[PDB]
RNA sequence: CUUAAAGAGUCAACCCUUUGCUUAUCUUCCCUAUUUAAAUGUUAGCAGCCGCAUAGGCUG
């Protein structure tokens, strides 16, 4: 009767970013780059914890990683690549019937908009996260298919119209809508000032020697591929009471803040996917949300 | 005669560094043999053996503890809980730079082989890790054991993996022989009955548990017999080197 | 009590070449190598190892070995040597 | 009933100093800067603890880091930059309602006084800590928005009125009370004398061959950005029985003296924050203190 | 046909005071550095004219 979902339905991710390496340059001398190295320092502080005042007179010594621009370079340079891949509907472990009728129900999905918002998050430098705070200007250089595009200061929380973002979203939507691949080589330049703190990815480790460990590749500050990924796929402006774009998540999850904007309101990925497969009609943006979840990849479990 | 194709400096970011429950780090030979077989399936080129070497490698985390990856919510019936950090299994990731060498059956011209190889690599991963950049693959050939040394040193520089077998067992050999365990194959524990939940509806399925050997890392140069460093599938659902156990 | 319990969800699945055919392998871990080998590497002062605690936060809900060996299990640090920067 | 604070309510720091580098110049030839390098020396001393006189005949060897001006330069030059960042009421991690009603409760905070006292701590040279002792004169240079300002003769422990401090604090308060950012670029020149001991930031290393270790960057003596910052936000003169300004900490903690001048008397940041969100009224100086804690940054949740 | 397929570690921070490394000192004996040699890369480039000149062409 009802076409139910497999026990596990799995898709691979289709936006594949690399690690972001962090160099230091001068804004008007971008061909003399030097790597930003992770260092270690002592940090003494107080016990300023909301709970207990009875131990605020004691201190706490700590040691942490830190990363800074040198005192003779004013510009942070962040480098990475992003590979977009097609065949966004070939399941990796899910069955045949459910996945194929879903591929059929979603072939009319607005891929131009998804490609635009991906490329736009890349070009405006949302992937730079806290490295955006306090920048004089941000300049993004994207090299794709022997073409070089330059982007100056761009509004991140609005997907404002730009002819070059659209010109790259052309090829990106062409690959996503069909098959093949396309690789963008991305550079970011931020004018922060000589000696400014940069913000590499923070490590999630049980390490008693450090209170804060920054991600490093042979000592050089870097950012996790998965964090750049979480930045790029932040395109969801379609949940109820929508304010700012959030990352494509099956439950609209922002565990960061302790809320999920798609929990228990008929608008989660599984409700909408069961709808799409079982004959129901989908909004253009519900189609976009479900297909963006497929682009995200995942191992969606539960069912029979 | 004997043709090889080499791809140097394969920068890979995001490797699934857990090869088994007791080995975390360099992806094992089973992984690179599976990569070679995937290429065989996807291009049609017959892949005799593969030899891989680490140029750079780092497991994420500290010296004695691997990094955690932040699990994102993924399963049905969890909406009443997606407002909190998802529970979390261990999944150590790593980042590295490798050099690969595939022995292939090729009769055509080198340009066609190189282009097919590149077009495959552009669609692949390595042990789950995203491939960020690789050099242009190039072909070499060997008749006698003299040109084999040139093919060998063409991979320079990198540390390739040789199989030095198991004397007592994994743990005693690690302590006494100062070597490193490595997943070399699998042991079948029980046949799986129903392919309702498998990658295939038809392929034979088994619950398995890894089988290991004791390996060593050596500069492709200092290796004398290059066959001792070329890994391929084979007997008893393991993998091994063309030149057997390493002692020249 | 030594009865089998088949379950493949969440577990990895690889193809493996069996005589120019393929078997699907679903790997599971061996209790001996972690209970015994952890104790052994501890006895013989082997330090080239990662410590990995299994069944986080609530171990006793996982396994008796996890429940009573809360310090963690030792894994062989399989990092390879690296080509030095200078060449 | 009560607006409970979200468990992960946190603000990011808004006064961002860099690490300070330490050079040596001559007072009347400031274009010839040479860097002060951290060295290592042996130090032999006595066992002179208050407790045991039985060890008073025993000695002790150590090795320590040390930092001196050369014997041909007489002036220490400390260099750093400080970036002030606005949106001081937009929370980093906390949700909406608690943070939004707190932002409404504090829109009448004296941003002029906050900016003035920050800029003044920078201009009077409090950020120099022990490098201020024994100076024939101190000359501070602050560059901002293509405008250069020089300061000599400023009392560190009093917020005396100064026209240049106020003119810089104007831009600083324009950023802190609105949006945007601004970078003050700071140099300090101290006439200490040739060969004078200088005081970089000290490190802690569990067990090392070194008993006392100094903060260096590529071997050059330096000061932690957090130490300069702690000097910058020493503006709190509003705790009970206040003598001198203390650094803005939610409990008014001064761990160096083992006391907390705002702990356990309904003057801590958490009591005042709860009151402000839950209807109760705050003094003008209490609004200043709470906004200064928001500019400090930190986690304000259970 | 890769232990395949999937994932944001994030806010904040004063490490501070003080110091004698002291005494003394034999590094000694012996020694064959040898044969031989194409720097090749023909060097590989440029000085003057006409020119609206980084269009093209021409002088021994």
Automatic annotation (TrEMBL), chain A:
InterPro entries found in the cross-reference section: CRISPR-assoc_prot_Csy3
Taxonomic source organism: Vibrio phage ICP1_2011_A
The protein's name in its UniProt record: Csy3
Pfam families, per the entry: Cas_Csy3 (PF09615)
Automatic annotation (TrEMBL), chain B:
Source organism, top-level taxon: Viruses
InterPro entries named in the record: CRISPR-assoc_prot_Csy2
Annotated protein name in UniProt: Csy2
Provenance organism: Vibrio phage ICP1_2011_A
Gene: csy2
UniProtKB/TrEMBL annotation, chain C:
Protein name: Csy1
UniProt source species: Vibrio phage ICP1_2011_A
Region of the whole protein represented: 91 to 177 of 179
């Amino acid at each position: 009767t009802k076409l139910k979902a497999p026990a596990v339905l799995a898709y691979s991710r289709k936006i594949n970013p690399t690690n972001a390496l962090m160099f230091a340059v001068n804004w008007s001398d971008r061909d003399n780059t030097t790597a930003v190295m992770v260092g270690t320092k002592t940090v003494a502080g107080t016990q300023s914890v909301r709970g207990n005042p009875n131990d605020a007179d004691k201190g706490n010594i700590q040691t942490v990683n830190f990363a800074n621009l040198p005192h003779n370079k004013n510009t942070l340079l962040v480098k990475y690549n992003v590979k977009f891949v097609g065949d966004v509907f070939k399941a990796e472990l899910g069955g045949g019937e459910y996945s194929n009728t879903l591929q059929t129900a979603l072939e009319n999905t607005d891929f131009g908009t998804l490609a635009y918002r991906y490329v736009y998050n890349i070009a405006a430098g949302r992937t730079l996260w806290r490295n955006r705070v306090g920048a004089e200007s941000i300049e993004t250089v994207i090299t794709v298919n022997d073409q070089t595009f330059t982007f100056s200061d761009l509004l991140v929380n609005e997907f404002d119209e730009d002819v070059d973002v659209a010109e790259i979203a052309d090829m990106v939507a062409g690959v996503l809508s069909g098959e093949g691949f396309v690789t963008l080589k991305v550079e970011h330049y931020m004018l922060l000032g000589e000696g400014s703190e940069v913000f590499p990815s923070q490590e999630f480790v049980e390490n008693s020697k450090l209170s804060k460990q920054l991600f490093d590749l042979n000592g050089q500050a870097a950012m996790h591929d998965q964090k750049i990924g979480n930045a790029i796929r932040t395109i969801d402006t379609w949940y109820e009471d929508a304010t700012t774009p959030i990352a494509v998540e099956p439950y609209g999850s922002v565990v960061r803040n302790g809320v999920a904007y798609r929990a228990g309101n008929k608008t989660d990925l599984f409700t909408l996917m069961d709808g799409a497969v079982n004959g129901k009609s989908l909004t253009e943006e519900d189609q976009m949300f479900v297909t963006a979840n497929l682009i995200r990849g995942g191992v969606f479990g539960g069912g029979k | 005669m004997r043709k090889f194709i080499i791809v140097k400096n394969v920068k890979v970011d995001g490797i699934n560094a857990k090869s088994s429950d007791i080995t975390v780090g360099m992806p094992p030979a089973t992984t690179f043999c599976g990569l070679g077989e995937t290429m065989s399936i996807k291009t049609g080129i017959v892949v005799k053996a593969v030899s891989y070497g680490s140029v750079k490698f780092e497991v994420r985390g500290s010296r004695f503890n691997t990094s955690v990856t932040k699990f994102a919510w993924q399963d049905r019936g969890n909406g009443g809980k997606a407002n909190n950090n998802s529970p979390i299994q261990p999944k150590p990731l790593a980042d590295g730079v490798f050099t690969l060498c595939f022995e292939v059956e090729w009769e055509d011209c080198a340009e066609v082989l190189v282009d097919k190889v590149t077009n495959f690599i552009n669609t692949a991963r390595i042990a789950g890790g995203t491939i960020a950049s690789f050099n242009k693959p190039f072909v070499k050939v060997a008749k006698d054991a003299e040109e084999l040394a040139s093919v060998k040193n063409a991979m320079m520089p990198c540390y390739v993996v040789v199989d030095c077998g198991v004397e007592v067992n994994i743990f005693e050999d690690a302590v006494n022989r100062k070597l490193q365990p490595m997943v070399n194959g699998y042991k079948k524990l029980e046949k799986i009955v129903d392919n309702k939940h498998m990658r295939d509806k038809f392929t034979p399925a088994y619950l398995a548990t890894p089988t290991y050997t004791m390996i060593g890392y050596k500069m492709v140069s200092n290796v004398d017999n290059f066959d001792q460093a070329l890994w391929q599938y084979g007997e008893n659902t393991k993998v091994k080197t063309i030149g057997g156990i390493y002692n020249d | 009590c030594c009865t089998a319990k088949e379950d493949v969800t969440t577990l990895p699945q690889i193809y493996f070449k069996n005589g120019e055919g393929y078997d699907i392998l679903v790997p599971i871990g061996n209790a001996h190598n972690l209970i015994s080998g952890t104790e052994y590497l501890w006895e013989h002062k082997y330090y080239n190892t990662f410590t990995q605690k299994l069944g986080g936060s609530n171990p006793q809900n996982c396994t008796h070995a996890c429940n009573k060996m809360r310090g963690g299990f030792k894994q062989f640090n399989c990092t390879p040597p690296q080509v030095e920067d200078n060449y």
